[PDB]
Amino acid sequence: STAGKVIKCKAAVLWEVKKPFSIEDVEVAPPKAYEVRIKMVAVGICGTDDHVVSGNLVTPLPVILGHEAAGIVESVGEGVTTVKPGDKVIPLFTPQCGKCRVCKNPESNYCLKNDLGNPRGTLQDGTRRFTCRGKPIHHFLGTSTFSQYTVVDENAVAKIDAASPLEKVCLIGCGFSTGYGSAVNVAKVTPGSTCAVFGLGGVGLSAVMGCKAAGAARIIAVDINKDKFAKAKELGATECINPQDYKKPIQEVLKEMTDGGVDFSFEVIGRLDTMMASLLCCHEACGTSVIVGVPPASQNLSINPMLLLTGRTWKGAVYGGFKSKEGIPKLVADFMAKKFSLDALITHVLPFEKINEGFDLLHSGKSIRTVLTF
Amino acid sequence: STAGKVIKCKAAVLWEVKKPFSIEDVEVAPPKAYEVRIKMVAVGICGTDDHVVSGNLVTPLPVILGHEAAGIVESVGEGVTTVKPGDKVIPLFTPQCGKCRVCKNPESNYCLKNDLGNPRGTLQDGTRRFTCRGKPIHHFLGTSTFSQYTVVDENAVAKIDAASPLEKVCLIGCGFSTGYGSAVNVAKVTPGSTCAVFGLGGVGLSAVMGCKAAGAARIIAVDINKDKFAKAKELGATECINPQDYKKPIQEVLKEMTDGGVDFSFEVIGRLDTMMASLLCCHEACGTSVIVGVPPASQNLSINPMLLLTGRTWKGAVYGGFKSKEGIPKLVADFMAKKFSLDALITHVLPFEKINEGFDLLHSGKSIRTVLTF
Ligand SMILES: NC(=O)c1ccc[n+]([C@@H]2O[C@H](COP(=O)([O-])OP(=O)(O)OC[C@H]3O[C@@H](n4cnc5c(N)ncnc54)[C@H](O)[C@@H]3O)[C@@H](O)[C@H]2O)c1
Ligand SMILES: NC(=O)c1ccc[n+]([C@@H]2O[C@H](COP(=O)([O-])OP(=O)(O)OC[C@H]3O[C@@H](n4cnc5c(N)ncnc54)[C@H](O)[C@@H]3O)[C@@H](O)[C@H]2O)c1
Ligand SMILES: [Cl-]
Ligand SMILES: [Zn+2]
Ligand SMILES: [Zn+2]
Ligand SMILES: [Zn+2]
Numbered sequence: 001s002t003a004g005k006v007i008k009c010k011a012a013v014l015w016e017v018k019k020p021f022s023i024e025d026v027e028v029a030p031p032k033a034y035e036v037r038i039k040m041v042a043v044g045i046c047g048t049d050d051h052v053v054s055g056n057l058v059t060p061l062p063v064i065l066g067h068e069a070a071g072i073v074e075s076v077g078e079g080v081t082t083v084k085p086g087d088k089v090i091p092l093f094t095p096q097c098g099k100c101r102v103c104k105n106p107e108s109n110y111c112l113k114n115d116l117g118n119p120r121g122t123l124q125d126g127t128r129r130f131t132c133r134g135k136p137i138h139h140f141l142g143t144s145t146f147s148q149y150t151v152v153d154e155n156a157v158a159k160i161d162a163a164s165p166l167e168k169v170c171l172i173g174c175g176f177s178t179g180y181g182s183a184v185n186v187a188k189v190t191p192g193s194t195c196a197v198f199g200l201g202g203v204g205l206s207a208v209m210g211c212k213a214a215g216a217a218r219i220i221a222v223d224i225n226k227d228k229f230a231k232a233k234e235l236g237a238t239e240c241i242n243p244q245d246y247k248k249p250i251q252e253v254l255k256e257m258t259d260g261g262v263d264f265s266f267e268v269i270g271r272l273d274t275m276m277a278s279l280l281c282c283h284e285a286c287g288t289s290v291i292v293g294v295p296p297a298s299q300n301l302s303i304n305p306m307l308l309l310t311g312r313t314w315k316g317a318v319y320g321g322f323k324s325k326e327g328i329p330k331l332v333a334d335f336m337a338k339k340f341s342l343d344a345l346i347t348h349v350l351p352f353e354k355i356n357e358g359f360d361l362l363h364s365g366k367s368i369r370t371v372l373t374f
Numbered sequence: 375s376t377a378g379k380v381i382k383c384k385a386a387v388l389w390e391v392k393k394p395f396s397i398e399d400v401e402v403a404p405p406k407a408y409e410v411r412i413k414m415v416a417v418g419i420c421g422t423d424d425h426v427v428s429g430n431l432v433t434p435l436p437v438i439l440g441h442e443a444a445g446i447v448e449s450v451g452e453g454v455t456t457v458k459p460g461d462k463v464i465p466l467f468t469p470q471c472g473k474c475r476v477c478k479n480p481e482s483n484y485c486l487k488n489d490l491g492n493p494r495g496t497l498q499d500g501t502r503r504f505t506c507r508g509k510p511i512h513h514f515l516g517t518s519t520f521s522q523y524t525v526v527d528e529n530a531v532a533k534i535d536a537a538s539p540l541e542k543v544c545l546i547g548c549g550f551s552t553g554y555g556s557a558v559n560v561a562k563v564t565p566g567s568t569c570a571v572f573g574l575g576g577v578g579l580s581a582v583m584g585c586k587a588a589g590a591a592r593i594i595a596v597d598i599n600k601d602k603f604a605k606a607k608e609l610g611a612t613e614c615i616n617p618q619d620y621k622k623p624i625q626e627v628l629k630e631m632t633d634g635g636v637d638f639s640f641e642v643i644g645r646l647d648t649m650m651a652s653l654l655c656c657h658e659a660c661g662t663s664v665i666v667g668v669p670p671a672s673q674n675l676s677i678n679p680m681l682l683l684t685g686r687t688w689k690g691a692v693y694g695g696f697k698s699k700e701g702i703p704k705l706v707a708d709f710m711a712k713k714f715s716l717d718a719l720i721t722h723v724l725p726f727e728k729i730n731e732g733f734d735l736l737h738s739g740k741s742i743r744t745v746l747t748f
């Protein structure tokens with residue numbers, strides 16, 4: 001069996017930036033106390049993973065990426081009370097340690113045991129658990145789901161419904177709950193409002209889907225990629241516009257189109273020009289601009305503070321404001337109850353081994369979410 | 375009767391920037407329809423006035439400044455349904471025109487009729503009601519209270535309580551409502567939270583009072599002027615901090631002092647560095663930072679969007695988010711119902727003819743609020 005023994009499996013390792021992943025044999029150490037070893041069943045490719053490949057989000061290399069996933073618990077360490085082997089689970093990229101300031105504060109979810117802020121590349125106890133060619137391989141956001149087995153801290157893992165379709169539900173681990181919560185919990189979109197959503201990746205489209213579930217009267221979807229429009233529209237966008245069609249700055253276009261700005265604007269791309277245009281496009285006295293895309297390392301925005309004095313709210317959030325371990329369970333329950341559908345987001349299913357082809361699909365505007373099967 | 379004819383009186387006219395005010399004889403035209411001519415009983419000197427003298431807030435010159443005030447209604451023009459001659463009045467620097475998007479929206483207050491954003495120095499119909507030496511003099515924020523008589527549009531004037539100390543209550547026209555409102559209505563300070571306030575002028579200490587009124591467990595008051603601390607402590611600040619006493623940046627000191635950051639920070643000064651230190655000292659995952667001070671003409675902050683992505687909110691607000699015409703009276707009522715005391719703030723009362731003396735007191739930290747009487 002495997003419980004308590006090292007596991008040897010395939011995993012896609014990123015040895016260098018801007019280089020392909022290498023499906024390698026790696027040894028995965030057993031769970032220490034309060035840790036869980038999971039067997040990956042399905043994983044989604046998310047833009048945050050692509051940012052590490054591209055050089056925009058620095059994390060310690062070599063690394064096993066991946067964080068949007070669903071799997072079955074193979075073994076649990078001592079102390080682990082929340083998980084039992086055989087339990088279906090979604091690994092959370094933001095832990096909910098339950099004992100820090102942020103975790104106790106009912107409205108905050110960026111727990112202090114996270115590894116996004118200043119990435120160590122390890123698990124919470126400071127150590128790694130993957131070895132490939134004798135060398136230690138670093139973890140990513142403490143989840144590293146781009147491997148057939150991974151070890152995750154207990155506070156970073158959620159037990160979900162035993163009947164959950166893991167090849168659909170893995171989206172709720174990052175992309176969907178991020179997009180949808182951005183609208184429903186972060187910006188708190190109001191019925192009848194006008195919302196703009198910049199970027200239509202699987203997180204951008206769940207933001208559209210969150211604005212529609214909130215009662216937004218209008219949802220303008222912005223993207224330089226026309227092919228995304230049909231899905232946006234099907235999911236709730238009232239209109240879709242492409243910045244390259246206009247001769248004047250996209251915030252001016254939208255201000256003119258909405259009687260001086262939207263009420264709620266969402267940036268789900270991660271570029272500075274669109275984070276600025278997304279601030280600008282919202283109404284000067286009643287707009288909320290929510291930052292969802294992750295910015296390129298060390299870059300800055302020069303804003304005039306007056307943009308804010310008149311009444312604008314600029315905020316950002318991680319995971320759609322969901323406290324990870326309590327939220328992702330309930331959102332799967334909702335999923336089961338048929339409250340929403342993830343099917344339009346999943347455009348491709350590839351075997352794990354075809355991971356690089358999955359990143360090529362993202363890079364070409366051909367895929368919204370690619371799911372990788374183990 | 376004064377009515378229907380051009381009044382000639384005294385007004386402190388600013389002819390050039392960084393120049394002493396000239397107390398001069400000007401002609402205040404009669405009210406057109408939907409306008410009101412008011413006799414100034416008391417005027418507070420507020421930081422926004424000073425910025426026009428400094429050159430920090432550009433506005434068409436010559437101009438008669440002033441916007442913090444209480445007076446009695448001399449004549450009302452035609453169609454004026456809300457105030458009658460003799461009615462006690464506080465002119466509002468931000469109108470509540472009742473009909474625009476911002477006015478119909480229950481949460482916003484920067485009515486579109488405002489003359490703050492792109493100041494044209496006239497009343498809402500695009501014309502001035504003041505003359506001096508065969509020259510039209512401009513208005514400031516459609517209020518121009520540094521004149522014995524001023525004409526203001528109707529939507530920009532509130533009928534306050536018939537029995538109100540007009541020498542006290544005029545602070546509610548700007549400073550008290552802005553500072554207090556910023557805390558209670560914009561930041562929405564929570565019971566038991568910890569707030570930091572940068573700048574302890576008239577607006578600043580009213581923010582200290584608002585946080586205390588909101589139930590903040592800790593209120594740290596920051597000011598390079600050590601003499602304001604006694605008042606701050608008296609008004610609610612649990613601690614006072616002078617940036618010059620340190621060797622490390624004030625955010626670092628405050629982050630350290632407050633377990634990672636303050637829950638609510640208010641910048642009530644208007645400098646870029648303090649807007650920055652104000653963003654930085656509130657907790658990255660749950661702090662709200664509120665901009666209240668007014669920024670120098672065309673100066674930008676280079677910020678890193680990761681500062682918001684972790685979860686902190688950044689918002690500005692005009693008038694402490696009070697709908698003006700509806701708000702200032704309810705507060706005058708609260709003052710009248712013994713809810714708070716403006717006394718600590720009214721530091722000096724001078725005859726209006728000493729207005730340049732009043733600005734010198736401000737320019738030396740002697741004064742918190744100087745009231746100019748008529
Ligand atoms: N805040 C978080 O919690 C959180 C969570 C998950 C993902 N993210 C971030 O969300 C962002 C996107 O996520 P995704 O997985 O949905 O990625 P994605 O690649 O599928 O979506 C990006 C979309 O933006 C569009 N786009 C690119 N340039 C554009 C431009 N100049 N103008 C308009 N649109 C443009 C692209 O066509 C693409 O459709 C990434 O930056 C990711 O890092 C953040
Ligand atoms: N948003 C609005 O609705 C609104 C309304 C009223 C006033 N304001 C703005 O509020 C700001 C000030 O209000 P005020 O009327 O009380 O003026 P004020 O001059 O009396 O008070 C400003 C305080 O800032 C302190 N200070 C100065 N430099 C400092 C520094 N470098 N670091 C820390 N503290 C410093 C000064 O000692 C003073 O105590 C002004 O910028 C005014 O324009 C805005
Ligand atoms: Cl004129
Ligand atoms: Zn993600
Ligand atoms: Zn925590
Ligand atoms: Zn209005």
Ligand SMILES: [Zn+2]
Pocket residue numbers: 420421422423441442548549
């Ligand atoms: Zn003022």
